[PDB]
Structure formats: C-alpha cells, structure tokens
Amino acid sequence: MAASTDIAGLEESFRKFAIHGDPKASGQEMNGKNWAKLCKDCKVADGKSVTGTDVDIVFSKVKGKSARVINYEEFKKALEELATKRFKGKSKEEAFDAICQLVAGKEPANVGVTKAKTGGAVDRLTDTSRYTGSHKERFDESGKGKGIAGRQDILDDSGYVSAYKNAGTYDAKVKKLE
C-alpha cells in the first residue's frame, strides 16, 4: 500500500538506529553494529531461528558493494530474509509486516542506554570524515548494476579433487603460481 510511505513506523525506527552518531546522515544507510543492535532491541534475533552470527551474515550478504553500511532498500531486503527465517509458510505480506511489527516504533535502548564511554573519539584530524572536501555519492542512482555485475552468490565446491593426489607439487589451490 502506497509505493513510497509503506510502513512509516519501521522507517522511523530505521532512522533511530541510522542517525545513531551522526544526525546529518538523515537515514540513508546503517552499519553492522547498529543493525546488530536493531535485531537485539527488537529481539528479532531470537537465537532459535536467527542468531547473532546469522544477523551479521545477512548484513554481509545484502550489501554487495563491500560497504561498511547498507542502504534502506537492502535493509528492507534483509528484513525479508529474517522474515522468511521465522514467519515462513505464511503469506509473504503477513510475514514482512509481522517482522516489521516487532521493530517499528522503538529506539536503540532497552529502557536503559548502553554505557560505551571509553572509546577514544578524539581522533579529530579534520581529514576524518571532513564532510566538505572528502567525498559524496555520485549520481549513479538511476543506472546501477542489476545483480552488481555477474549476479555472483556462492562458488562453493566439494573440495577440489586431484587425480591420485600429487597433481602439481600437491594441492596448490591458486597458490601464487596458477
């Protein structure tokens, strides 16, 4: 419903964790830490279906462009993932709205805030972030790569079997000389 302002509350909670640190980011992306906490605060990572590691895996999968952070589109794509982890078997819409229902409205803090005062953030060398002078996203929002380039998911093999062993000074799997 409404291809733009779909859920609202979910988008609000996204901002809550997105602007965690920098309020000028608006709410375009989210890093692995804030995303990990997002699941924790909303207890989407229940441990029985979705564990901490699995949450980091999803984040490491959907991103694609290396990226310390994922954009809103890939966030709602990640939600579909965790949704199918728990609410699978039901209606696609219900599963998606359900997982969002467990998140929407809350902020990065289970009643009490997380005491983290100890990490030296005094590294203000001006070069750090810098805003005006470093770099901003170039206009490539219209023409992006469908599946990055070659789709690229997993190239996992049985373990590379060599005839009667030996082969070439033992199993030199892409060992420098190839």
- What is the residue type of 47? G
Give the span between the Cα atoms of 29 and 63, in whole angstroms. Answer: 10
Give the span between the Cα atoms of 28 and 73, in whole angstroms. Answer: 9
HSE toward the beta carbon, residue 13, CA cutoff 13 A: 22
Please answer whether residues 16 and 9 qualify as being in contact, where contact means their C-beta atoms are separated by less than 8 angstroms.
Answer: no
Helix (H/G/I), strand (E/B), else coil: 30 = strand
Query: Minimal CA–CA distance to 1: which of 90, 85, 100, 105?
Result: 100
- Residues facing residue 170 across a β-bridge: 167
Q: Which position has the token pair 């988008």?
A: 11
Give the span between the Cα atoms of 72 and 43, in whole angstroms. Answer: 20
Please answer whether residues 94 and 87 qualify as being in contact, where contact means their C-beta atoms are separated by less than 8 angstroms.
Answer: yes
Residue 34: which residues within 8 A CB-CB, separation 6 or more? Answer: 17, 18, 20, 108
The structure's method of determination equals NMR
Q: What six digits make up the tokens of 110?
A: 């289970």
Give the phi and the psi of residue 95 in degrees, each rounded to 5: -60, -45
CA distances, 65 to each of 32, 113, 148, 171 (Å): 14, 32, 8, 32
Query: Minimal CA–CA distance to 18: which of 61, 71, 58?
Result: 71
Question: Could you count the other beta carbons within 10 Å of the beta carbon of residue 116?
Answer: 6
Give the span between the Cα atoms of 175 and 178, in whole angstroms. Answer: 7
Query: Minimal CA–CA distance to 38: which of 25, 50, 24, 23?
Result: 50
Maximum C-alpha span of the chain? 63
Question: Could you count the other beta carbons within 10 Å of the beta carbon of residue 28?
Answer: 12
Q: What is the DSSP string of 80-138?
A: HHHHHHHSTTS-HHHHHHHHHHTTTT--SSSSS----TTS------SSSS-STTS----
Eight-class DSSP state of 68: S
**What is the crossing angle of helices 9-18 and 32-41, to 10°?**
130
Please give the angle made by the CA atoms of 101, 105 and 109, to the nearest 5 degrees: 115
Reduced to 3 DSSP states, what percent helix, strand and coil does the chain have, rounded to the nearest 5?
Answer: 30, 5, 65
